[PDB]
Design an enzyme around this catalytic site. Sequence first.
Site, PDB file in Angstrom:
ATOM      1  N   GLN A  33       0.770  -1.151  -0.121  1.00  0.00           N
ATOM      2  CA  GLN A  33      -0.043  -0.041  -0.032  1.00  0.00           C
ATOM      3  C   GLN A  33       0.825   1.239  -0.140  1.00  0.00           C
ATOM      4  OE1 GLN A  33      -3.320   0.999   0.184  1.00  0.00           O
ATOM      5  NE2 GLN A  33      -2.626   3.198   0.874  1.00  0.00           N
ATOM      6  N   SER A  88       6.188  -0.772   2.355  1.00  0.00           N
ATOM      7  CA  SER A  88       6.456  -0.880   3.746  1.00  0.00           C
ATOM      8  C   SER A  88       6.602  -2.248   4.034  1.00  0.00           C
ATOM      9  CB  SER A  88       5.171  -0.336   4.470  1.00  0.00           C
ATOM     10  OG  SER A  88       4.046  -1.272   4.641  1.00  0.00           O
ATOM     11  N   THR A 102       0.609  -7.168   3.009  1.00  0.00           N
ATOM     12  CA  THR A 102       1.048  -7.602   1.712  1.00  0.00           C
ATOM     13  C   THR A 102       2.556  -7.039   1.168  1.00  0.00           C
ATOM     14  OG1 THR A 102       0.528  -7.750  -0.665  1.00  0.00           O
ATOM     15  CG2 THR A 102      -0.476  -5.710   0.706  1.00  0.00           C
ATOM     16  N   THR A 153       0.711   2.971  13.515  1.00  0.00           N
ATOM     17  CA  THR A 153      -0.425   2.728  12.663  1.00  0.00           C
ATOM     18  C   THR A 153      -1.010   1.307  12.732  1.00  0.00           C
ATOM     19  OG1 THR A 153      -1.363   3.211  10.640  1.00  0.00           O
ATOM     20  CG2 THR A 153       1.046   2.658  10.504  1.00  0.00           C
ATOM     21  N   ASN A 174       9.070   7.227   8.992  1.00  0.00           N
ATOM     22  CA  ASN A 174       7.979   8.338   8.981  1.00  0.00           C
ATOM     23  C   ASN A 174       8.223   9.354   9.974  1.00  0.00           C
ATOM     24  OD1 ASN A 174       6.130   5.711   8.323  1.00  0.00           O
ATOM     25  ND2 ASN A 174       6.021   7.361   6.750  1.00  0.00           N
ATOM     26  N   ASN A 207       5.154  11.480   0.451  1.00  0.00           N
ATOM     27  CA  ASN A 207       5.558  10.652  -0.844  1.00  0.00           C
ATOM     28  C   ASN A 207       6.312  11.675  -1.724  1.00  0.00           C
ATOM     29  OD1 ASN A 207       4.257   8.721   0.436  1.00  0.00           O
ATOM     30  ND2 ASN A 207       2.762   8.294  -0.986  1.00  0.00           N
ATOM     31  N   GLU A 224      27.477   1.248  -9.732  1.00  0.00           N
ATOM     32  CA  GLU A 224      28.518   1.785  -8.975  1.00  0.00           C
ATOM     33  C   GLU A 224      28.203   1.669  -7.488  1.00  0.00           C
ATOM     34  OE1 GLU A 224      31.076   3.558 -10.115  1.00  0.00           O
ATOM     35  OE2 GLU A 224      30.798   3.327 -12.353  1.00  0.00           O
TER      36      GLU A 224
HETATM   37  N1  LIG Z   1       5.899   6.889   3.320  1.00  0.00           N
HETATM   38  C1  LIG Z   1       4.690   6.554   3.072  1.00  0.00           C
HETATM   39  N2  LIG Z   1       4.239   5.562   3.600  1.00  0.00           N
HETATM   40  C2  LIG Z   1       2.811   4.998   3.757  1.00  0.00           C
HETATM   41  C3  LIG Z   1       1.910   5.434   2.827  1.00  0.00           C
HETATM   42  N3  LIG Z   1       0.662   4.900   2.757  1.00  0.00           N
HETATM   43  C4  LIG Z   1       1.055   3.848   3.749  1.00  0.00           C
HETATM   44  N4  LIG Z   1       2.067   3.919   4.309  1.00  0.00           N
HETATM   45  C5  LIG Z   1       2.435   3.236   5.459  1.00  0.00           C
HETATM   46  O1  LIG Z   1       1.767   1.588   5.155  1.00  0.00           O
HETATM   47  C6  LIG Z   1       1.874   1.018   6.406  1.00  0.00           C
HETATM   48  C7  LIG Z   1       0.679   0.416   6.829  1.00  0.00           C
HETATM   49  O2  LIG Z   1       1.006  -0.855   6.363  1.00  0.00           O
HETATM   50  P1  LIG Z   1       0.085  -1.274   4.760  1.00  0.00           P
HETATM   51  O3  LIG Z   1       1.023  -0.981   3.769  1.00  0.00           O
HETATM   52  O4  LIG Z   1      -1.360  -0.303   4.443  1.00  0.00           O
HETATM   53  O5  LIG Z   1      -0.589  -3.053   4.786  1.00  0.00           O
HETATM   54  P2  LIG Z   1      -0.502  -3.770   3.615  1.00  0.00           P
HETATM   55  O6  LIG Z   1       0.532  -4.593   3.670  1.00  0.00           O
HETATM   56  O7  LIG Z   1      -0.740  -3.053   2.316  1.00  0.00           O
HETATM   57  O8  LIG Z   1      -1.794  -4.583   3.734  1.00  0.00           O
HETATM   58  P3  LIG Z   1      -3.353  -4.004   3.491  1.00  0.00           P
HETATM   59  O9  LIG Z   1      -3.445  -2.538   3.475  1.00  0.00           O
HETATM   60  O10 LIG Z   1      -4.472  -4.626   4.548  1.00  0.00           O
HETATM   61  O11 LIG Z   1      -3.864  -4.484   2.235  1.00  0.00           O
HETATM   62  C8  LIG Z   1       2.076   2.363   7.401  1.00  0.00           C
HETATM   63  O12 LIG Z   1       2.985   2.205   8.181  1.00  0.00           O
HETATM   64  C9  LIG Z   1       2.270   3.544   6.663  1.00  0.00           C
HETATM   65  O13 LIG Z   1       3.534   4.309   7.271  1.00  0.00           O
HETATM   66  C10 LIG Z   1       2.709   6.649   2.026  1.00  0.00           C
HETATM   67  O14 LIG Z   1       1.895   7.049   1.047  1.00  0.00           O
HETATM   68  N5  LIG Z   1       4.035   7.002   1.989  1.00  0.00           N
HETATM   69 MG   LIG Z   2      -2.130  -5.333   1.856  1.00  0.00          MG
END
Ligand SMILES: Nc1nc2c(ncn2[C@@H]2O[C@H](COP(=O)(O)OP(=O)(O)OP(=O)(O)O)[C@@H](O)[C@H]2O)c(=O)[nH]1
Ligand SMILES: [Mg+2]
Lengths: 429, 429, 420, 420, 67
Positions: free
Chosen positions: A11, A130, A135, A169, A196, A218, A244
């Site tokens: 995500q 992340s 996922t 989070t 973050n 982002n 490099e």
């Molecule tokens: N730097 C940054 N971090 C993000 C962003 N969106 C989500 N995150 C991070 O995503 C983490 C939440 O876990 P997810 O990636 O949403 O969970 P997942 O593995 O995708 O599984 P689901 O979301 O339930 O489908 C948080 O810690 C956020 O810091 C973004 O736009 N920029």
């Molecule tokens: Mg996911």
Amino acid sequence: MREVISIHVGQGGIQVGNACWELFCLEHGIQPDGQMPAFNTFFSETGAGKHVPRAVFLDLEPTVIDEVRTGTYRQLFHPEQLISGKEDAANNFARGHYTIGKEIVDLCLDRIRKLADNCTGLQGFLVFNSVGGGTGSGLGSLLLERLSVDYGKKSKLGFTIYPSPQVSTAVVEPYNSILSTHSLLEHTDVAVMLDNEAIYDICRRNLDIERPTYTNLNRLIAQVISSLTASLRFDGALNVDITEFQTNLVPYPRIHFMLSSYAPIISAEKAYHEQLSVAEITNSAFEPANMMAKCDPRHGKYMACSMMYRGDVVPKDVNASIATIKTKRTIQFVDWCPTGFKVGINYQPPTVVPGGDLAKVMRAVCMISNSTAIAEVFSRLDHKFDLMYAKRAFVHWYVGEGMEEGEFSEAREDLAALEKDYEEVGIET
Amino acid sequence: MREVISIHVGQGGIQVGNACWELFCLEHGIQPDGQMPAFNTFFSETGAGKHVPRAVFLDLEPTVIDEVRTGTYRQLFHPEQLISGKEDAANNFARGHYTIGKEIVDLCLDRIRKLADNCTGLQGFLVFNSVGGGTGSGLGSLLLERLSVDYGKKSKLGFTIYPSPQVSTAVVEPYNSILSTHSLLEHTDVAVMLDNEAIYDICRRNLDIERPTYTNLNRLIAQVISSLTASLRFDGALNVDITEFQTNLVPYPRIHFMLSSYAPIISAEKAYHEQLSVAEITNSAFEPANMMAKCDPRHGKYMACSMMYRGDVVPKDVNASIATIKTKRTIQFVDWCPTGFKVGINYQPPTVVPGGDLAKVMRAVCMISNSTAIAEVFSRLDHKFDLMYAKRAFVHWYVGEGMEEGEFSEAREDLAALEKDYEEVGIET
Amino acid sequence: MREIVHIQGGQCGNQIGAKFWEVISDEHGIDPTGTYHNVYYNEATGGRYVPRAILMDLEPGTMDSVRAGPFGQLFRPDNFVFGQTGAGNNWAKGHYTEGAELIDSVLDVVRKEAEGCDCLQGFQITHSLGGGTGSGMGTLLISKVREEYPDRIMETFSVVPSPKVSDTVVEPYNATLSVHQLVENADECMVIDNEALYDICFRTLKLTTPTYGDLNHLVSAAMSGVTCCLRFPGQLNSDLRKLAVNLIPFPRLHFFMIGFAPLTSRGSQQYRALTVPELTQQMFDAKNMMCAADPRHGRYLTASALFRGRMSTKEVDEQMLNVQNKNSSYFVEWIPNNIKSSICDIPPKGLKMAVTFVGNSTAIQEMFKRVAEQFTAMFRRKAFLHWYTGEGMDEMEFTEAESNMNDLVSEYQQYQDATA
Amino acid sequence: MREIVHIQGGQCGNQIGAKFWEVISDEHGIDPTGTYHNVYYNEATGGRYVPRAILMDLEPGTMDSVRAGPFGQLFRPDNFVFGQTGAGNNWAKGHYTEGAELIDSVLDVVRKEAEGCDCLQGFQITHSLGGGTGSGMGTLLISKVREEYPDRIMETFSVVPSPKVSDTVVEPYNATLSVHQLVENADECMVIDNEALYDICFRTLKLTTPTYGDLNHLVSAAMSGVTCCLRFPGQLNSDLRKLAVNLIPFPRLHFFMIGFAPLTSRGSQQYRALTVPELTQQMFDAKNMMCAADPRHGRYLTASALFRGRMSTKEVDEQMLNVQNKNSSYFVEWIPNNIKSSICDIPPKGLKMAVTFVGNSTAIQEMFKRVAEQFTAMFRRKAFLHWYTGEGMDEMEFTEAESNMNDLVSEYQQYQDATA
Amino acid sequence: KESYFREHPHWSDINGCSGAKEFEGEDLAYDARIKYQKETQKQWIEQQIREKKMREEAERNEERAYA
Ligand SMILES: Nc1nc2c(ncn2[C@@H]2O[C@H](COP(=O)(O)OP(=O)(O)OP(=O)(O)O)[C@@H](O)[C@H]2O)c(=O)[nH]1
Ligand SMILES: [Mg+2]
Ligand SMILES: Nc1nc2c(ncn2[C@@H]2O[C@H](COP(=O)(O)OP(=O)(O)OP(=O)(O)O)[C@@H](O)[C@H]2O)c(=O)[nH]1
Ligand SMILES: Nc1nc2c(ncn2[C@@H]2O[C@H](COP(=O)(O)OP(=O)(O)O)[C@@H](O)[C@H]2O)c(=O)[nH]1
Ligand SMILES: Nc1nc2c(ncn2[C@@H]2O[C@H](COP(=O)(O)OP(=O)(O)O)[C@@H](O)[C@H]2O)c(=O)[nH]1
Ligand SMILES: [Mg+2]
């Protein structure tokens, strides 16, 4: 004859990639709908007028992929690169790496094979994700495994958003984050630790905003990655390929966990009242206050530093300022690597994204440091891990999905060894 | 000086032929009115204006022939080349091979004899029959024997539709298909095995058509056959002959069951995003998903692949793309065929049919592969037969038309012979 | 006096011969109607000039090929001896079933066109080695004429199938079937591959889209050059038999290698010179020869070099001696002055000098080894054999055929190690 | 007569070669269209001049570096042997894995451009010792050519790793792994270091914005001056082999120092005056040279001074004797009259006198310690060693090399303070 | 068949030369050729999409009628 594959999973990875493609399609004169009124790295010709980006977006929750399909850049991508699952990841590991991820891994590998054959001078990958997620770690781990056992020589560039110390989070993020180290070492070459909280504070102090948001997050990450790839994409007095880094940043292929830094990150009015030469900018670069990760290198050492100066910058000033910064007392290198600062120059300045809070600057410096302090981060995380696994918290949600529980301690064993290895290279000989 | 005869017996092959003649008349400019406002391979001249196509339309059930005998194209054919019966075969064999066939196959023989003495340089036959119906099976066998003993020397190529892996439109399929295998081996020198679920999946994922139908599948098969006979019909920078197909693809008199594939099967939308070069098209022409028989080429081992192209092509592009193909590791060949890729070029791009989901595009490839994976298909079907013959199910319906019972076991061992061969040749030295 | 008949065969050889007559009518300056604008052409009532060649094939479609392109208006319509069915890409098909029908007619029309000459030096053929019509009917016709005309010599411009670039799948069989007989009844199998031609087109000329017409043009240039010191004056004239003596030292070490110079792109032609030094340096280059057999991976039993233009014989023969003495390792040592030069007083159109190079080398042995390999596989499994059996030929030939192949390369190899 | 070829490898070498051809065209008066407005250039149809140069590199980007810059149209595209990957600062890439894929072609084209001459005075290379591409490819090429022509000489205007101001991290590995060969199969390994070039550009010219173009301009001007006693007449002429005889006492002390004169900013150019005394006093100083080894920290085994312009030979030779007798300690005693002179009769373009100083001194030894010392602190922990270990190297190949380096530097000591 | 008849697109007229100077390599217009080819294909795809949209809208019309 130069190109990179930009796999975005999870995500956070996909939103960071959305902002990154915004910045890219912007700076190359490309219009967001795909047409055009120096790009063979990212975007490719599509046999009909416009250009399409080299990227594939894996995800299971259809919401973000749908938002991309109905956002601004709907005509940009290829309606196959957007692989959308059927359910969510539920913030566990076996449900993205053992039971469900096997539905999408093969389709992803076929799409990546297609992208690979459609390219000639491959140079590497760029995975963004992340690990506190469900996922972004699981499916990411499976993809790293399949690629490392499928392609081989091509080096991968992981961009992982770790859990920051205090801001949280999720409550189960230590578990699945540790569940990713068992595969981050083996299959991944370069891992740019991004947190973050540090970037939130960065947006607070420098950019003067008091209501920052994931979008600005982002934007900054996209800026850093564009400054990273400028050398491939553009001109420069001293170019630096993506082969490099392996020769300049990886002492031993088992300790390759770098951390970023960028400058100048200034708002509009705070550049008027300043000078912002190269010397001041390379002093500001090393300041742990505006480092892009949660770590205080004063409690560590520096193995190597790749600096890329984009914009109108002369080399002699870089050399002199490098001499000064290396002569400082509070920033100490290791003995076994005396000449550490690698530097490259590109003759293009930053290209501010429209509607951003940053200011146009004639110069910019992006540093990526392989340091030894980042190790403590891992240690800290283990702490959290233990205080859960001491009471078997949430182990049922993983054992319910075929995940043999005996892996857990193994990871907390294996990652533990990492710390020792850092205590093996901090040895002042 | 050269032409082909095409027979469409049954209800499946006859619909396929309806769509096929549709496409043919469309490409050669022949209006459906016969009178038009390189084609001697298909259409002859009845001395005045209208060009009559070479074919016979046999079916005992006169429903579909009445669809064409009064439909949009009744102006075209010869009212004697549309032979219809007054009943069906009711999906059993002997009633279309022993009792009712006895009357009609003689008339078919006379008509085919007339069409033969009309044409001068006839080069091959093309029967069009599913084996699911009693017509296409029994009538198919009887007519095949009659022709193989009448003409003989001439090659044969049956675009036969088998029953899919899991879906079916008749419950007595395994019976009235095994009895046609004996006919298909001896008299039918080659056999281009076609299935439905493969083209179903192709339509469901490539052309985005969510609710496909038999007419779409038939349009696609028509395109495939036009691509096959391109070199004979049209101009060519580097041609191939319908005799050259055989010796380049029949390594042994008892392993000649060839499958097919075609590209680019891509809708209008997705065509807006594709490299469109020869490289990617001859790359996608090897993926398992778009193999028109539901088999797993990743498992078997190819023997000989012929590739009829069309549209503007530089031969060096074909050579380099084939180099890349043979460089791919996951695909492997047998020892006794180091040169398995035969090519052939033509300079007529695909033709568009109003309502055809295929996007207009210059380049196009059509591959036909004699491979050894197809054996599993046979084995698969074998399983079905087992779970019927143990209970003599539906057998009296067959014995009630003069067919001895033991024929089932004999044809079963006959097909076990193929399951022995096609997994005997693909063995090391 | 000193005429030449030019038999064709297979659509490959037919296209090659079409482009060769293209280049010849260009050099002698004959527009496609046969009006001036004996070695190759014949006079014709009214003043026409009709080329002397016989075109044979089995797919009458290929007729419309030569009748289509310019300079197709030349051949007399009575020489177009064809069939009906076609080659079918099989050897026994076009050599034991269909060949055995039209070969008699081909022989009779060759006899009609032959005695129209007074002193016929030799032949030259154009065909592939695996293409059904070409390979089969050509080797049969060569058998007939070499058992008929022993005095003359049988030049042959066979385009070998290099198995790197694939077009057919049962080529090695017919390649062996043609080699076994051409070594037995043909004196100059000046083999040519397609790999090296596509390479010369990709780099030496920076060509992007080399179509068959272009490679045929380059081979046509070489074929015109191989006999320039014959129909044109020169300070040291050559023929088709001085070639035969200065080159082949044995009954069966008579398989050759070809080269031409100078070939340059546009962006490169502004930076070089045009002198016998650089023409020679470009001549011996590996990437400047039309045979997929690395010369450095062998030696030269001998070589001939026909220059066309006008230059001091001294620089020519001195640089010959020099380029021999430098690379005396890659030249055989039990043959003194293995090279031979020749000079013609008239170059082709456009250029000023032109080097047509021929070499009897012990390296093209490799260009057969590969074929052998394929055979040794596809024969022990007896693959694709049931076609070659029930049509007149039996397996027997195959076996012994491969035998001879070994012997052939074997002989070459020994002279690569014969030191005295 | 006495021709030279110009091999350039790596980014630094290629850019310096571009600047050097620019300066040579400036001197001989050739505009970029390669027309006049045989030692270096070569003729081509239409009176065109193409430099007898050869460009090689692993990353193709440097093409848009040499063709884009002015005077970039002199070269020939056939002399651009460019790979596609870029050795990526990894020595083993350009010497064991990727090297051996382009070394074949580059050796072929060197041989082509070499045989095209009659008197091959020697090769001269331009590359670096820190970058993987330059180091590896250049050292392998030097290996092959000194295995090919053991009689000619190989000068190398090869830069060295900057002592203090480092820009790479795998520098000492590359430096040692290339010195281990350049000590063996080179003759004039003139060494240049970026630190001393910045020292000159900041203290002798009072510049304020030195770009790599300007350092390359300086080193290329010195390069020209080194051999400009050959292209032109001389009251006492000289060439490369005269230097090679008068400058290396023992066959391995062949790493020189380079200096140029005169050099002046705006002010001093508006004030000072050029006379042989001032040029001499400016030349034999410490920070008028291109090596971060303060010559007073050592002595000069020998040193040649090439003068250019119209001067008084008695003044030149008398001041040579005077500067030898004055700073008698800084010289070495067991070689009497250890200073050598040479005079050309034509100055550069836009000047009236100039001086090129070439000193084989025992002061560079310090350098071959510091860089070497770096290795000792980066090899005791296998820092970055797994990369070279992965491409086929062996630890011995490192260690002995280091020892060799040690041996080399020790040699200076062993025969610096010796006498009888 | 009529093999070897087009060389898409080729067969220049009588004019030519005997040596090897021009070979029509790159056709001296390959770039404009690719550009115009791409434009033509984009036009084709635009037309096909413009048609498929209406063919689909017919279905919604039929659905409203059935309701
Ligand atoms: N730097 C940054 N971090 C993000 C962003 N969106 C989500 N995150 C991070 O995503 C983490 C939440 O876990 P997810 O990636 O949403 O969970 P997942 O593995 O995708 O599984 P689901 O979301 O339930 O489908 C948080 O810690 C956020 O810091 C973004 O736009 N920029
Ligand atoms: Mg996911
Ligand atoms: N792909 C495809 N399959 C078809 C088509 N038309 C019929 N079939 C298949 O035909 C098979 C049935 O065999 P048929 O020979 O047509 O049945 P029949 O003609 O009623 O046999 P009898 O009436 O007993 O003589 C079914 O499996 C159909 O899927 C078509 O247009 N396209
Ligand atoms: N260099 C070149 N090779 C050709 C040409 N035409 C055909 N070939 C080769 O001819 C081979 C097949 O022989 P072919 O004459 O087509 O068989 P046929 O059916 O008996 O006429 C193929 O492998 C082609 O590569 C041509 O124009 N130029
Ligand atoms: N004096 C000078 N030094 C240069 C120049 N360019 C590069 N250098 C140095 O040369 C080293 C790299 O050598 P390079 O030619 O790039 O080889 P590569 O790194 O293997 O491609 C680095 O230390 C550069 O700083 C230049 O233009 N002038
Ligand atoms: Mg029916």
